[PDB]
Design an enzyme around this catalytic site. Sequence first.
Site, PDB file in Angstrom:
ATOM      1  N   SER A 224       8.529   7.883 -22.854  1.00  0.00           N
ATOM      2  CA  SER A 224       8.488   7.289 -21.541  1.00  0.00           C
ATOM      3  C   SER A 224       7.047   7.470 -21.072  1.00  0.00           C
ATOM      4  O   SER A 224       6.231   8.118 -21.731  1.00  0.00           O
ATOM      5  CB  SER A 224       9.503   7.982 -20.623  1.00  0.00           C
ATOM      6  OG  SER A 224       9.393   9.395 -20.583  1.00  0.00           O
TER       7      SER A 224
ATOM      8  N   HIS B 237       9.349  13.689  -7.080  1.00  0.00           N
ATOM      9  CA  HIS B 237       7.975  13.246  -6.971  1.00  0.00           C
ATOM     10  C   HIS B 237       7.859  11.720  -6.761  1.00  0.00           C
ATOM     11  O   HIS B 237       6.740  11.211  -6.629  1.00  0.00           O
ATOM     12  CB  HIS B 237       7.183  13.663  -8.217  1.00  0.00           C
ATOM     13  CG  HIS B 237       7.354  12.876  -9.502  1.00  0.00           C
ATOM     14  ND1 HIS B 237       8.053  13.248 -10.563  1.00  0.00           N
ATOM     15  CD2 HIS B 237       6.762  11.666  -9.786  1.00  0.00           C
ATOM     16  CE1 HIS B 237       7.930  12.321 -11.476  1.00  0.00           C
ATOM     17  NE2 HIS B 237       7.146  11.382 -10.995  1.00  0.00           N
TER      18      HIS B 237
ATOM     19  N   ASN C   6      13.751  -9.054 -15.067  1.00  0.00           N
ATOM     20  CA  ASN C   6      12.368  -9.356 -14.747  1.00  0.00           C
ATOM     21  C   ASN C   6      12.115  -8.988 -13.289  1.00  0.00           C
ATOM     22  O   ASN C   6      12.681  -9.580 -12.322  1.00  0.00           O
ATOM     23  CB  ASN C   6      12.123 -10.810 -14.957  1.00  0.00           C
ATOM     24  CG  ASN C   6      10.676 -11.175 -14.810  1.00  0.00           C
ATOM     25  OD1 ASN C   6      10.214 -12.072 -15.491  1.00  0.00           O
ATOM     26  ND2 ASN C   6       9.793 -10.549 -14.075  1.00  0.00           N
TER      27      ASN C   6
ATOM     28  N   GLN D 174       4.019   6.624 -17.418  1.00  0.00           N
ATOM     29  CA  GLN D 174       3.900   6.317 -16.004  1.00  0.00           C
ATOM     30  C   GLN D 174       4.655   5.052 -15.582  1.00  0.00           C
ATOM     31  O   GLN D 174       4.601   4.046 -16.286  1.00  0.00           O
ATOM     32  CB  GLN D 174       2.444   6.174 -15.666  1.00  0.00           C
ATOM     33  CG  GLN D 174       1.827   7.549 -15.435  1.00  0.00           C
ATOM     34  CD  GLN D 174       1.637   8.390 -16.686  1.00  0.00           C
ATOM     35  OE1 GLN D 174       1.304   7.850 -17.738  1.00  0.00           O
ATOM     36  NE2 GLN D 174       1.834   9.696 -16.628  1.00  0.00           N
ATOM     37  N   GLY D 175       5.418   5.076 -14.485  1.00  0.00           N
ATOM     38  CA  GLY D 175       6.203   3.943 -14.023  1.00  0.00           C
ATOM     39  C   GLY D 175       7.681   4.068 -14.397  1.00  0.00           C
ATOM     40  O   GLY D 175       8.550   3.394 -13.828  1.00  0.00           O
TER      41      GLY D 175
ATOM     42  N   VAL E   9      10.298 -11.819 -11.031  1.00  0.00           N
ATOM     43  CA  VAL E   9      10.979 -13.096 -10.789  1.00  0.00           C
ATOM     44  C   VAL E   9      12.374 -12.850 -10.242  1.00  0.00           C
ATOM     45  O   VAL E   9      13.101 -11.893 -10.674  1.00  0.00           O
ATOM     46  CB  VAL E   9      11.101 -13.904 -12.111  1.00  0.00           C
ATOM     47  CG1 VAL E   9      11.958 -15.158 -11.951  1.00  0.00           C
ATOM     48  CG2 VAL E   9       9.698 -14.326 -12.534  1.00  0.00           C
TER      49      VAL E   9
ATOM     50  N   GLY F 150      11.602   8.975 -12.666  1.00  0.00           N
ATOM     51  CA  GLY F 150      12.794   8.881 -11.847  1.00  0.00           C
ATOM     52  C   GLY F 150      13.937   8.165 -12.556  1.00  0.00           C
ATOM     53  O   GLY F 150      15.080   8.258 -12.083  1.00  0.00           O
TER      54      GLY F 150
ATOM     55  N   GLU G 201      18.121  -5.715 -11.645  1.00  0.00           N
ATOM     56  CA  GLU G 201      16.890  -6.294 -12.128  1.00  0.00           C
ATOM     57  C   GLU G 201      16.762  -6.359 -13.633  1.00  0.00           C
ATOM     58  O   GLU G 201      17.251  -5.492 -14.364  1.00  0.00           O
ATOM     59  CB  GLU G 201      15.664  -5.508 -11.648  1.00  0.00           C
ATOM     60  CG  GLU G 201      15.409  -5.577 -10.153  1.00  0.00           C
ATOM     61  CD  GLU G 201      14.770  -6.878  -9.720  1.00  0.00           C
ATOM     62  OE1 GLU G 201      14.719  -7.832 -10.485  1.00  0.00           O
ATOM     63  OE2 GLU G 201      14.301  -6.945  -8.597  1.00  0.00           O
TER      64      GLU G 201
ATOM     65  N   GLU H 109      20.222  -9.897  -8.560  1.00  0.00           N
ATOM     66  CA  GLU H 109      19.510  -8.860  -7.830  1.00  0.00           C
ATOM     67  C   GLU H 109      20.200  -8.513  -6.524  1.00  0.00           C
ATOM     68  O   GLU H 109      20.797  -9.390  -5.898  1.00  0.00           O
ATOM     69  CB  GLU H 109      18.117  -9.262  -7.430  1.00  0.00           C
ATOM     70  CG  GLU H 109      17.205  -9.407  -8.610  1.00  0.00           C
ATOM     71  CD  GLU H 109      17.047 -10.827  -9.095  1.00  0.00           C
ATOM     72  OE1 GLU H 109      17.843 -11.706  -8.769  1.00  0.00           O
ATOM     73  OE2 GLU H 109      16.087 -11.064  -9.807  1.00  0.00           O
TER      74      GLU H 109
END
Length: 223
Positions: free
Chosen positions: A172, A40, A54, A174-175, A57, A178, A52, A62
């Site tokens: 956990s 989804h 932050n 939303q966000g 920033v 996965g 990652e 990264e």
Amino acid sequence: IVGGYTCGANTVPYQVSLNSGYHFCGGSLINSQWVVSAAHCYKSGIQVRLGEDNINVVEGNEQFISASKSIVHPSYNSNTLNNDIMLIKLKSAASLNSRVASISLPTSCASAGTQCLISGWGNTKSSGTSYPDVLKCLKAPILSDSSCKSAYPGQITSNMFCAGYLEGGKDSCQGDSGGPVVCSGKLQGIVSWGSGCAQKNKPGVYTKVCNYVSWIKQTIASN
Ligand SMILES: [Ca+2]
């Protein structure tokens, strides 16, 4: 993550942020070229952001890599959320080092009571919205199948498990979707769905990754 704690920069080295001009889903790096996430979370124009902490920033460590293909499970059902799992092949291989590393797939399913680490950049409020800049962590146990099916009668397939706290307050949200549920150094779950976040008697429901290991391997091997 509701009721969790700041992980600390790069202490969860397999955690991925899926970004389309903003963070919309988590994922887990399972080798230098492939990410596992929820079906989804599918969309086109995904950039996978590795290393990652932050997310707002650029801090160093990264790696931003485009998805070259996303493979939603052929039997994913959007109404039931059964088989909510997706594989993303990266355009080029990630550099694995200290700060970026893969997590192993399980050889066995985890048992009820196994404690696991769930991590993500999702909402931190059970009522209202507060998105974190840095990665949050939560330790949560896998619940028994009868507590899971009592909480969500008629909605739990064999490809799902509940993890969390019936008392509510830690979950956990939303966000976080996965993202990884790691138990004993193995990827056991993918953040999928739940009723609200950190509500009493409504634990989170997770895709049971041990049911998919030969599908993952066969798919990676032919792509
Ligand atoms: Ca960053």
